[PDB]
Amino acid sequence: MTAAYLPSILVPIIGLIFPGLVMAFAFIYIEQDE
Amino acid sequence: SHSVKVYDTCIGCTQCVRACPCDVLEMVSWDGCKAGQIASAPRTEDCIGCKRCETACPTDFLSVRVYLGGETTRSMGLAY
Amino acid sequence: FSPVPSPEGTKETYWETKAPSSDVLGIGAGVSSGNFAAASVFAALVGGYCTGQVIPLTVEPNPLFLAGSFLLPYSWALHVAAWIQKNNGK
Amino acid sequence: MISDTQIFIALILALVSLVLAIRLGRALYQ
Amino acid sequence: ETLNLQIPSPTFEGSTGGWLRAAEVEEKYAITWTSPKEQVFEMPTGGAAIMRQGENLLYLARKEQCLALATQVKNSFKITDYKVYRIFPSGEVQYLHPKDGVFPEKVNAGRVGVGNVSHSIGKNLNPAQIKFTSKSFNG
Amino acid sequence: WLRDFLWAQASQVIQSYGSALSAYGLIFLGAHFIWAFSLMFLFSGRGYWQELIESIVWAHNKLNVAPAIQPRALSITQGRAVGLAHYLLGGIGTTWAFFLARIISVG
Amino acid sequence: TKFPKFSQALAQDPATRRIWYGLATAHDLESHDGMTEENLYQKIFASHFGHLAVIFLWTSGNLFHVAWQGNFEQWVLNPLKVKPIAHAIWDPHFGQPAVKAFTKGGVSYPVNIATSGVYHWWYTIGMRSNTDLYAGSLFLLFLAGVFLFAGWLHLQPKFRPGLSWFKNNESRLNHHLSGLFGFSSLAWSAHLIHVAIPEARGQHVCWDNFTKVAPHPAGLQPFFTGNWGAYAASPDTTNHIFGTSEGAGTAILTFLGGFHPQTQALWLTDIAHHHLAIGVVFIFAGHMYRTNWGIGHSLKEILDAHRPPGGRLGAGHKGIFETLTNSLHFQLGLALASLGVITSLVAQHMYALPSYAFIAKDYVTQSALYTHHQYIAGFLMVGAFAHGAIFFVRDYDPEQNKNNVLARILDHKEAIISHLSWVSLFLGFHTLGIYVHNDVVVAFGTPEKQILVEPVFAQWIQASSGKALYGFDVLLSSTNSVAANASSNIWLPGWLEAINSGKNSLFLPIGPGDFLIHHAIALALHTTTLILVKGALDARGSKLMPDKKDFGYAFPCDGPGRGGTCDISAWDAFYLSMFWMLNTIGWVTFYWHWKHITIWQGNAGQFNESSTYIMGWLRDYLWLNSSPLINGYNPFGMNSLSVWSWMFLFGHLIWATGFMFLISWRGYWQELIETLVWAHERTPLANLVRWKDKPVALSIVQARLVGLIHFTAGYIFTYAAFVIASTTGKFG
Amino acid sequence: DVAGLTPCGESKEFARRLDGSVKKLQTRLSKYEAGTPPALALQKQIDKTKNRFDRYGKAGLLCGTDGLPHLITDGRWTHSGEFVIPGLLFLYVAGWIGWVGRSYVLFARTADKPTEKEIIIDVPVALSFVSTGFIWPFSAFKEFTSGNLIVPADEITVSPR
Numbered sequence A: 001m002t003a004a005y006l007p008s009i010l011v012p013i014i015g016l017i018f019p020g021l022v023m024a025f026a027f028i029y030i031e032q033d034e
Numbered sequence B: 001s002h003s004v005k006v007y008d009t010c011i012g013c014t015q016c017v018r019a020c021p022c023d024v025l026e027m028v029s030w031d032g033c034k035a036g037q038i039a040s041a042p043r044t045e046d047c048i049g050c051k052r053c054e055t056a057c058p059t060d061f062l063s064v065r066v067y068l069g070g071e072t073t074r075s076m077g078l079a080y
Numbered sequence C: 001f002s003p004v005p006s007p008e009g010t011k012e013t014y015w016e017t018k019a020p021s022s023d024v025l026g027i028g029a030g031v032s033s034g035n036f037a038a039a040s041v042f043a044a045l046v047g048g049y050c051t052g053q054v055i056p057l058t059v060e061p062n063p064l065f066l067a068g069s070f071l072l073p074y075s076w077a078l079h080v081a082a083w084i085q086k087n088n089g090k
Numbered sequence D: 001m002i003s004d005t006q007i008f009i010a011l012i013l014a015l016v017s018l019v020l021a022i023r024l025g026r027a028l029y030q
Numbered sequence E: 001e002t003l004n005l006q007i008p009s010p011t012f013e014g015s016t017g018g019w020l021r022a023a024e025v026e027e028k029y030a031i032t033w034t035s036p037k038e039q040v041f042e043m044p045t046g047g048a049a050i051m052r053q054g055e056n057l058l059y060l061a062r063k064e065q066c067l068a069l070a071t072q073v074k075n076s077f078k079i080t081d082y083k084v085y086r087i088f089p090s091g092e093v094q095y096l097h098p099k100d101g102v103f104p105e106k107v108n109a110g111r112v113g114v115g116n117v118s119h120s121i122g123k124n125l126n127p128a129q130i131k132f133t134s135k136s137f138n139g
Numbered sequence F: 001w002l003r004d005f006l007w008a009q010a011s012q013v014i015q016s017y018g019s020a021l022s023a024y025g026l027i028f029l030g031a032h033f034i035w036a037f038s039l040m041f042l043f044s045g046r047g048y049w050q051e052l053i054e055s056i057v058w059a060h061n062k063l064n065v066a067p068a069i070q071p072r073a074l075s076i077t078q079g080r081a082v083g084l085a086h087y088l089l090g091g092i093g094t095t096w097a098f099f100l101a102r103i104i105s106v107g
Numbered sequence G: 001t002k003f004p005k006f007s008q009a010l011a012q013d014p015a016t017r018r019i020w021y022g023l024a025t026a027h028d029l030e031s032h033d034g035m036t037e038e039n040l041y042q043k044i045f046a047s048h049f050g051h052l053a054v055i056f057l058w059t060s061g062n063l064f065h066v067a068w069q070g071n072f073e074q075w076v077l078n079p080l081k082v083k084p085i086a087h088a089i090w091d092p093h094f095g096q097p098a099v100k101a102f103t104k105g106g107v108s109y110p111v112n113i114a115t116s117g118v119y120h121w122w123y124t125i126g127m128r129s130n131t132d133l134y135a136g137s138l139f140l141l142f143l144a145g146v147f148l149f150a151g152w153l154h155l156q157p158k159f160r161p162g163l164s165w166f167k168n169n170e171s172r173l174n175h176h177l178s179g180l181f182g183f184s185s186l187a188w189s190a191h192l193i194h195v196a197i198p199e200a201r202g203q204h205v206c207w208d209n210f211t212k213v214a215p216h217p218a219g220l221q222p223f224f225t226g227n228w229g230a231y232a233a234s235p236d237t238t239n240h241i242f243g244t245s246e247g248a249g250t251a252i253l254t255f256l257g258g259f260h261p262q263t264q265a266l267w268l269t270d271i272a273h274h275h276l277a278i279g280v281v282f283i284f285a286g287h288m289y290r291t292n293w294g295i296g297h298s299l300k301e302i303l304d305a306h307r308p309p310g311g312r313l314g315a316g317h318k319g320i321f322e323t324l325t326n327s328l329h330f331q332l333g334l335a336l337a338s339l340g341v342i343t344s345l346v347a348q349h350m351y352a353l354p355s356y357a358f359i360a361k362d363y364v365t366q367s368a369l370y371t372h373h374q375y376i377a378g379f380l381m382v383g384a385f386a387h388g389a390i391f392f393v394r395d396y397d398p399e400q401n402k403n404n405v406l407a408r409i410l411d412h413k414e415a416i417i418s419h420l421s422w423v424s425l426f427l428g429f430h431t432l433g434i435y436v437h438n439d440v441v442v443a444f445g446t447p448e449k450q451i452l453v454e455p456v457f458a459q460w461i462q463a464s465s466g467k468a469l470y471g472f473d474v475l476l477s478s479t480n481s482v483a484a485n486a487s488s489n490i491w492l493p494g495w496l497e498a499i500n501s502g503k504n505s506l507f508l509p510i511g512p513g514d515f516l517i518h519h520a521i522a523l524a525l526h527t528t529t530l531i532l533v534k535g536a537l538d539a540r541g542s543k544l545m546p547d548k549k550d551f552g553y554a555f556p557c558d559g560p561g562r563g564g565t566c567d568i569s570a571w572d573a574f575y576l577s578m579f580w581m582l583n584t585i586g587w588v589t590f591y592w593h594w595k596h597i598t599i600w601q602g603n604a605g606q607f608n609e610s611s612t613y614i615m616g617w618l619r620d621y622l623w624l625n626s627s628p629l630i631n632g633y634n635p636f637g638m639n640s641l642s643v644w645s646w647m648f649l650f651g652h653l654i655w656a657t658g659f660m661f662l663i664s665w666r667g668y669w670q671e672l673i674e675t676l677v678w679a680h681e682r683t684p685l686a687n688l689v690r691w692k693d694k695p696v697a698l699s700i701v702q703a704r705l706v707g708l709i710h711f712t713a714g715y716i717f718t719y720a721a722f723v724i725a726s727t728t729g730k731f732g
Numbered sequence H: 001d002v003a004g005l006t007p008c009g010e011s012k013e014f015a016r017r018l019d020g021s022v023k024k025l026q027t028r029l030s031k032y033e034a035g036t037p038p039a040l041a042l043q044k045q046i047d048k049t050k051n052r053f054d055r056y057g058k059a060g061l062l063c064g065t066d067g068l069p070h071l072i073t074d075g076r077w078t079h080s081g082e083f084v085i086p087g088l089l090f091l092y093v094a095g096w097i098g099w100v101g102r103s104y105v106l107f108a109r110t111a112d113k114p115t116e117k118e119i120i121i122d123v124p125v126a127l128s129f130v131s132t133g134f135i136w137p138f139s140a141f142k143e144f145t146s147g148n149l150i151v152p153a154d155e156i157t158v159s160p161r
Ligand code: CLA
Pocket: A006, A007, A008, A010, A011, A014, D010, D011, D014, G054, G057, G058, G060, G061, G062, G064, G087, G088, G089, G090
């Protein structure tokens, strides 16, 4: 595979950091009074 | 809150008022029917939406109608 | 809920009479019932003749017979217009 | 075959599409 | 008229069914009634309590709990002397029931009709007629 | 459990046709049917069925053959009781047929 | 307290119900607070640009992942032996046996094998290398950006269209028929003639040379002379090797019928002439309506004038024009019904008349494509009836529709609903009775007492198309007949060659098993139609709730009075018809898949004998074909079917979890949740943490939706794992 | 024959069905002595099997490739005994049952307690009705044309809509 390092970089980020960050910020947005 | 309406087919039987568990309904004076009284909904902020009033109503289609609306702590029946 | 637009020249075509108003014929509103009836028979005969002449279809069909074959369905619309005009006194 | 530089061009254009999707989503959200 | 906070509560051994933090931070309901006897009743939130002869006072979380107990006292012990209050954490006490001294199932003068619609239920407006309009469906 | 118990041991019920154990093969299928049929009563509500009965009553009124005992959809509780009875009958029946044909053939 | 910014009633709910309901109502813009008609149409326009951009990003992603990680060039060399690759696997939970088991496809990394058919589609239309797959992915990324920008642009104050634009029916119909349908069909004919057909014949044509390479040797000279038939001369020979110059002809528009003998697919020159003729017809259709120049039709005038004079339709279609124009739900219902029929035609005509080279030898791709498009068809058909119910509740005005076709439908809704009830019961009693008949009588050792009805009507239709298998001589089957003689010079030889070889799926032979399953399909259709029609026609009112329209489309019930009113809303008739849609698509895809795996093995007699009773369906289809699937892993190892073997169990779990939401209802759960609220408040070290939203049990309608979603997802995942793994494991 | 089917009397697969069905019974009979009750039971089952196969062969039924009889139901008269005539018999019985039940519900409406007549059936009157059904086609059509079968649309309760 060409640029074979890309899955091992992007899959943890897309699979863990991206949902962890959207859950954190969605939680902040849905639990704010203003 | 829930929205409770009384239509002018009410025969003034007071059954809705007695069946309401949250003292939402009461009887007021009205010349339209033979009983001289009609049901009223002055305290719908306390209505939990049980629809026991509609069950009690004997007119062919209900003179009292409950329309479930926005939920609050009172209308959700939450003791917490 | 808001005004629905229609093209300019839109008129009312709802009818409960024996025949619709001649306005339902569009550009053919002024043609006589005899002229639609003769066009109806003419288009039916010419269209049927042209259709018949190319029923075994080949890789070389005569284009005039193909185009003339479209006169058969057009004749149906012509005799409907003839009935409409005869019942509107035209 | 595809070079990694070609992959990087694709990633740039998808980044531009992400920026445009954010702007459209904010416009729809008002 | 106002709730006398000093009225003795009916004897009760406690339960988990009582009120929670929402009562001390949002609102609480209180009910008082007169008993001619020192007799056992059932709490809306649990087991059995004993109402003391004289004046009793309870605290509950929901208005429906105070009225379910009121229905019970009237049906079994024939106690029609019950007054239901709402209490806010600010100390404000709000008299609730019976709202004008007379039970709602009995007519009273000076009651104004709320929610009364001049036509029958089949004469309401179709939803399409009042779409993108503020007009109410009750005619 | 799926492969080595249910799949492997259902061989006797499903191959029982034409033998003395064909009754168990038929009851295996029939109980699968009754079990599935129960979900009609369990996932549904009374109001749909009363409104459907209204159109059926209309067709009877049209032919002047409506009954004097007015048809009703089953009560809410009875819809639950009928769903539970047919669920248990189908599930226990499916196991009854599976257990008996399997152990009669192999044991 | 501000998430549902479009709903102040939900933004003030203090429970967890606010989050769920805010997520579930987000796209229902008509009900959002302070929504005008201007803003409703403009938000729908912008979100249609956003949906188009999502579709272009999905297509570019498939092209990119195949270009990057696929084996497209190796598959192109040897398409019947190589298994196409979808994308690579990078999963840090894999064991090393799992890494080895998924390293198929001729590559050095674990990989998924594609069941979508995109390889056969891209090969047939011209793609030959990875670099033009990558070129297509960058073009779709650009188009996605263009449509995201256009969606943003048409929300800007100067570029926001008025309602007068959004309701111009005649200009939109002219442009969508002549440009969106017709001209793009003409342009696809151009692509086939200029690129796909030349590269099907060995000659590369791309943007670098397509202006200096003529599609035809004569070249646009026969077109401008009327010598059009010179473009059909010298078609591809039956010795042609697709992709190469050997056996290749020079025709571009020839009509031959039948299949290319080696690809088993329709000729590319038939497809190019199809799209040329469709393009011409649709461009002509797109000049029907009057826009700005005084020729054409008013849609309002056509609708108003079509009232039959006998009076049987009442006022006819008077007032339908305004009703359809003002109701987006009526438009959605018509669009979804039309789309549902087409995606069913796509499923039926793509297995019987395949257009892509070497597909229909990919039994997994053929099975997945049929199943996929039939499930999409069932969802679109349910949605059409759901949005017709929403139309009657919300958008229908009985006073602008006096004595219409619509009002007269509602005027005889009990005649309609009771006759659907009768035909559903009529079909059900006897189809199930014959199936149980054959079951019981085969069980007692007497299969010759079965009731086996020959499907003579469909066999006669097959013979009318030229099938010489049932000895019916009517129409095309007769050597001498006006129908047979008329088509003899054009498509009839190739069509008879295609329909009288038993090597394809064109008009497959049918028998008593096909008769019984067709009646079961008819029972399933009429019953799903019953539930949906009953929901649409009783949506406005019934005898239990004569005022049902005042409560909306989706409300839980009217309470326990009047006997009980659970599932009384029109939404609950959508809910109930979703089970019957799943059941009917199950019966359809089970029938398609069993008939095809038995034919592909060479054992059609196994379907012929076992399909007439239900134990044949249970042991010879579900039980017999489960074994490669459930052995994807076992205590002795694992193979590449291990993922479908897991999805299979996964599907059984979700489906059963749906039962919990569908059988058990709210009151039980609210009382549990109150004991959990108490326990949290009384537990030390834990009551330091407090909820912002009061935990409540799900609502009645929400629980119905969640159970429906779990049921449906389990249904899809279980069958997808089965239909893919059993066909893969068997290869036949 | 019809639809490429073969008459069951000359189908070879039908003959193999009959032979396999009899061998299966004969191998069960090979485990019993001559006069035993299981031997008489299986010999009577072999006679029944042979009789059924013989009757099917001579009836004009058509067999398939699987050797099982197939039914032709397109309306042709050479095959009316498989659907058209059983269907005529059914519709005569079903219309009888419907006509008789309808006559009893109309009788029960004119009763002192109409709903008690439906859970406690007046058996002499209901038997008077069951006997009348033999001429239901004529009675029901005369009922129809005399305006007593169909009630007009305005005496039927419908939903408000
Ligand atoms: C809808 C399109 C789509 C989908 C479903 C996938 C799916 C996948 N890609 Mg991706 N990919 C796509 C488009 C897509 N691709 C495009 C257009 C590009 C070119 C820029 C890439 C470039 C790319 C790389 C470089 C890699 C993947 C990888 C992967 C795999 C792991 C996920 C990952 O790391 O994502 C990361 C993906 C990206 C950073 C690209 C952006 C994804 C697209 C453009 C966004 C689509 C958004 C969608 C429309 C809306 C989603 C929101 C939804 C909630 C509504 C997975 C099979 C990884 C892989 O192969 O692992 C084995 C990997 O390393 N992809």
